[PDB]
Amino acid sequence: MADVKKQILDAYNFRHATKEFDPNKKVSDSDFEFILETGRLSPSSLGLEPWKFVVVQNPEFREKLREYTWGAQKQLPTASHFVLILARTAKDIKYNADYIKRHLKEVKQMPQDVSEGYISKTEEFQKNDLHLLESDRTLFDWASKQTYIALGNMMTAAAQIGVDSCPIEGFQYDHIHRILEEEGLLENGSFDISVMAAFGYRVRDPRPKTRSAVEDVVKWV
Amino acid sequence: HHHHMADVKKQILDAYNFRHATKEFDPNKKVSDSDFEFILETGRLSPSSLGLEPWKFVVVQNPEFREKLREYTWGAQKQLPTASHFVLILARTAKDIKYNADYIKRHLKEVKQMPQDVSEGYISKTEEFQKNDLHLLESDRTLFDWASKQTYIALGNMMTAAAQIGVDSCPIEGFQYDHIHRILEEEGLLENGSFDISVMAAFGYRVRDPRPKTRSAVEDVVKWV
Ligand SMILES: Cc1cc2nc3c(=O)[nH]c(=O)nc-3n(C[C@H](O)[C@H](O)[C@H](O)COP(=O)(O)O)c2cc1C
Ligand SMILES: Cc1cc2nc3c(=O)[nH]c(=O)nc-3n(C[C@H](O)[C@H](O)[C@H](O)COP(=O)(O)O)c2cc1C
Ligand SMILES: [Cl-]
Ligand SMILES: [Mg+2]
Ligand SMILES: [Mg+2]
Fold it and tell me: In whole angstroms, what is the distance from residue B146 CA to residue B130 CA?
């Protein structure tokens, strides 16, 4: 698979945490729809797809976010596209929530017979397997983990088509939460902010990428 | 160059459609050593918050150890025995990824090559980030789950990369934490409390094709502002 592998690893080395984008270079509609598709097609635990990708293009709303997003001071103004990745809350992804039943039926096409058992399994899984019901936050964080699959996928896919990105956690939750809630974007408590991601074209190449040695992050048994 | 661009997108989306949660692999078909090294590299090269790389990829090839895990991994009953390669993705614990931990200092100095003024500032930023920005110090588990989120980036990447080279996978959360934790602890895999289990992933070759993939319509998971 030598050619494919090289192309992919070149994209992994292309992708970096871009701090500033070219404000005059926009990702095409087609390319951005492809990036979003890699998010949409991502896998998720129990197939629940507990995410929403909010594409904030409005400059004024970006600036509202920027006040409380220390990690995106240049990324927010300059990005071609800027995404808030939301995750479902306990309201919607506790085992007995209506969202789960509707998703399994309407999206996953899971028969009613089958979903009864699947939701019973989900219940035991959340309570006793992974202890996800420890708190409402524990359960949100579980949903949020699924969103990080989508995050990783979207950034990598972007890089493979020559589009830079930057994942962003550097924000003040309390303030971002309020802003999104008041804007309506959390859908009556269905969602909360998980992670942000900018997309666009770099202005300068970065310094060489650094990572742990393979022997320090891989072990064979 | 436009056709090539379009073909890159097509081939990637084909891989996204190829990848599925494979329930059973072919026990007679192994991923090559070279192919699996590539898959691991996509994990290693993944980004992480604060660059901390708070993961370990444990490749469990030993069939007896797989079987020990199987007892307590309801979500991998056929995947454990049949997979070509099986990975336990571990995440760093509070011991190592709280702002004031030695792991962070060493990582910033030796991997990230920061001079001390820069790492001191970075660690100060990390402290405020954990305490007050994202409230990660609510509990040891809050902090662990933050490290675990980073590992899900690597999980996603590895599975997608595998699919791009025709290798099936299955992500796995369906396990009893208490028992898996003990099994890995007793084997020495958690490195004296440095790590805990985050998520599992199997790799190999399918034995049958899945049913069509289902996902939410794009208009229901994307909103423009
Ligand atoms: C983090 C995670 C954990 C999962 N755990 C299991 C599991 O234990 N066993 C399993 O068979 N499938 C597992 N799944 C697979 C999901 O059910 C599957 O990804 C989802 O329904 C979407 O289907 P697809 O991956 O075939 O596209 C898991 C998925 C993810 C992302
Ligand atoms: C979830 C996540 C959150 C991050 N938050 C920020 C951020 O707020 N601002 C920033 O400039 N970089 C941010 N980073 C980028 C990391 O510092 C960077 O990914 C890491 O040092 C590895 O470098 P690379 O991505 O350039 O390969 C974040 C990374 C991840 C994965
Ligand atoms: Cl366009
Ligand atoms: Mg246009
Ligand atoms: Mg062609």
Answer: 10
**Rounded Cα–Cα distance for residues B114 and B100 (Å):** 16
DSSP helix/strand/coil, A99: helix
> What span, in angstroms and rounded, lies between the C-alpha atoms of A209 and B112?
9
- Name which of A212, A171, A142 is nearest B148 in CA terms: A142
Cβ distance of A152 and B153 shorter than 8 Å: yes
- Domain locations in chain A as residue ranges: 41-202
Tokens standing for B123? 């660690």
* Contact of B168 with B205, CB cutoff 8 Å: yes
| Cβ–Cβ < 8 Å for B204, B82 | yes
| B61: nearest CA partner in chain A | A221
Is residue B39 a contact partner of residue B186, using CB atoms and an 8 Å limit? no
> How far is the C-alpha of B89 from the C-alpha of B60, rounded, in Å?
11
User: Which method resolved this structure?
Assistant: X-ray
Which residue among A36, A43, A153 places its CB closest to the CB of B218? A36
Amino acid at A47: G
- Cβ–ligand 2 distance for A43 under 6 Å, the answer no
Tokens of A189: 């408590």
Nearest CA to A15 out of A170, A213, A209 is that of A209
Resolution as reported, in Å: 1.1
CB contact at 8 A, A143 and A87: yes
Concatenated DSSP letters of B126-152: HHHIIIIIS-GGG-HHHHHHHHHHHHH
Distance CA A133, CA B128 (A): 27
CB A126 within 8 A of CB A95: yes
Architecture of domain A41-202: 3-Layer(aba) Sandwich (3.40)
A148/B134 Cα distance (integer angstroms) = 16
